[PDB]
């Protein structure tokens, strides 16, 4: 009994109606098909059990049904806290085995939001260790696509920076990005102006944050 879940991911606005389908190969009783919600870094939470029954405390905009070989989870009015990955689960009475669908990520589409840019120079504590890490923070933006480019003394950097993007926020559906430029103490002490330049769909002109080694 192999489940097949669809779609892999979807994007919908607040107030929209989303549906997720798990097709059960073979015959599963309506009593033994369940739906779980997993928010990032958290354990799965039971949303619906036995095809259509809401779990305790689960909002009734969630619902489920079956149409033959196909099972359907439906959110009637999408809300930002519904950002999660959803899994179906099936139990087979012959073998006592359990199988999970491969999951559906539900992202929230919202209005464009420009990031807030901050720059952090390396700390004296880290420089006393031989390395220097300059950090550039993009705070609360949408959409996720963003470009952070590093300039040292107006020279463009490449291959010495790593970035990281948060998952979508459960309150306002925004993202945040952290880009780290790393140099040795030697190279860091050999230059003076350090800047990150940000381009984002919500910025009509790129935003630059910079500091001067010293002041």
């Amino acid at each position: 009994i192999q489940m097949t879940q669809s779609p892999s991911s979807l994007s919908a606005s607040v107030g929209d109606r989303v549906t997720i389908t798990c097709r059960a190969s073979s015959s599963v009783s309506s009593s033994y098909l369940h739906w779980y919600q997993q928010k990032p870094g958290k354990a799965p939470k039971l949303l619906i059990y036995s095809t259509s029954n809401l779990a305790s405390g689960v909002p009734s905009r969630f619902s489920g049904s079956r149409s033959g070989t196909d099972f359907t989870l439906t959110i009637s009015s999408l809300q930002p806290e519904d950002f999660a990955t959803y899994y179906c689960q099936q139990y087979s009475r012959r073998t006592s085995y359990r199988t999970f669908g491969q999951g559906t990520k539900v992202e929230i589409k919202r209005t464009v939001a420009a990031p807030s840019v901050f720059i952090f120079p390396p700390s004296d504590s880290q420089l006393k260790s031989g390395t220097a890490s300059v950090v550039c923070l993009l705070n609360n933006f949408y959409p996720r696509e963003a470009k952070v480019q590093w300039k040292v003394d107006n020279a463009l950097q490449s291959g010495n920076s790593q970035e990281s993007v948060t998952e979508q926020d459960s309150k306002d559906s925004t993202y945040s990005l952290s880009s780290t430029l790393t140099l040795s103490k030697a190279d860091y002490e050999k230059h003076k102006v350090y800047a990150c330049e940000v381009t984002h769909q919500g910025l009509s002109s790129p935003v630059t944050k910079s500091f001067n080694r010293g002041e």
Binding site: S31, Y32, H34, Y36, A43, P44, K45, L46, Y49, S50, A55, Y87, Q89, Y91, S96, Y97, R98, T99, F100, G101, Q102, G103, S116, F118, I119, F120, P121, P122, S123, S125, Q126, S129, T131, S133, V135, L137, N139, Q162, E163, S164, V165, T166, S176, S178, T180, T182
Partner: protein
């Protein structure tokens, strides 16, 4: 009031073994089966097996039956997952979950990350990201913590022992060129509070038993 809390995860060499624990509370441990489900990073949920604490026997998916065992000690309300001959593909987040009703999982543990690797553990170094504004600037300010050169995942970062929650972003770790992880944790606060409110970033990396509390100060 029903709770499952796990423990046991960490770094393990390939071909080695590890034992995870699931402490149950808030109900009669003997009346509900307890199962284990793992999730590889980025991938989906995978059922492993389960135990019935009333008898002590266990079922297993055919993928794990030869390699893993599940026991239960009813006096301590604890279930155990013994994992043997671990491979790189066994690196995952392991959950225990209680079965109730028509065979659904209604209470899950928090998850414990197991890493199968032959690299040695490394405790993190914790550096301040000093606030951007002065206390006289007028708006919001960003401040933070850089958690560099640790192995393996995970680290837990909190602010002011967890009392500071709103506006906190802890970013996913990024595997550096050296093979060690590095992440940053930032919070935004009112500029006016920079001179009075203490901001401490608490870092905990269990694999190396490192608990550091780094105070972040301006300038």
């Amino acid at each position: 009031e029903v709770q499952l809390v796990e423990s046991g995860g960490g770094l393990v060499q390939p071909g080695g073994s590890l034992r995870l624990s699931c402490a149950a509370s808030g109900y009669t441990f003997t009346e509900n089966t307890v199962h284990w489900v793992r999730q590889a990073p980025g991938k989906g949920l995978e059922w492993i097996g389960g135990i019935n604490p009333y008898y002590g026997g266990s079922i297993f998916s055919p993928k794990f039956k030869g390699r893993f065992t599940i026991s239960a000690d009813t006096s301590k309300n604890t279930a155990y997952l013994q994992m043997n001959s671990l491979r790189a593909e066994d690196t995952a987040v392991y959950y225990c979950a209680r079965r109730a009703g028509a065979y659904y999982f209604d209470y899950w543990g928090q998850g414990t990350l197991v890493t199968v690797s032959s690299a040695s553990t490394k405790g993190p170094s914790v550096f301040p990201l000093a606030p951007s504004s002065k206390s006289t600037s007028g708006g919001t300010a960003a401040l933070g913590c850089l958690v560099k050169d640790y192995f393996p995942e995970p680290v837990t970062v909190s602010w002011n022992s967890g009392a500071l929650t709103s506006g906190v972003h802890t970013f996913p770790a990024v595997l550096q060129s050296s093979g060690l992880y590095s992440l940053s944790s930032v919070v935004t606060v009112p500029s006016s509070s920079l001179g009075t409110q203490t901001y401490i970033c608490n870092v905990n990396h269990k694999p190396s038993n490192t608990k550091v509390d780094k105070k972040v100060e301006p300038k």
